[PDB]
Amino acid sequence: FNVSNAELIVMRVIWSLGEARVDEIYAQIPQELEWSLATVKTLLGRLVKKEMLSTEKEGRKFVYRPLME
Fold first, then answer.
1. What are phi and psi of 60, to 5 degrees?
2. Which residues contact 52 (CB under 8 A, 6 or more apart)?
3. Among 15, 17, 13, 54, CA closest to 62
4. What secondary structure, in 3-state letters, does 35-62 show?
5. Closest to 18 measured CA to CA, from 52, 59, 63
6. With contact defined as beta carbons under 8 Å apart, do 60 and 24 qualify?
7. Rounded to whole angstroms, how far apart are CA atoms 11 and 17?
8. Which of 67, 69, 55 is nearest to 22 (CA)?
9. Phi and psi torsions of 68, nearest 5°
10. DSSP class of residue 66?
11. 2-13 burial, b for 16+ CB within 10 Å, e for fewer?
């Protein structure tokens, strides 16, 4: 068994909340991880290309959200 994702961290938070903005998705990421803003931004770009999540331009920011029928 193996996989093609970075970490569950960013998927575990946003799924619950509904729609999370760029500053919001980053706000859920604590110092225990040692990550930076640039890290989550580059990780999103993998989620959104890999059919997990989608993203829209709202609140003069991006809104990152899941999609369903």
1. 55, 15
2. 5, 11, 66
3. 54
4. CCHHHHHHHHHHHHHCCCCEEEEECCEE
5. 63
6. no
7. 11
8. 55
9. -145, 160
10. -
11. eeeeeeeebeee
Distance separating alpha carbons of residues 64 and 57, to the nearest angstrom = 9
Domain layout of the chain by residue ranges:
1-69
Fold of 1-69: Arc Repressor Mutant, subunit A (1.10.10)
Residue with structure tokens 């110092």?
31
Token match 């920011």: residue? 61
Q: How far apart are the first and last CA of the chain?
A: 30
Tokens representing residue 5 in the block: 């994702």
Entry field: residues in the chain: 69
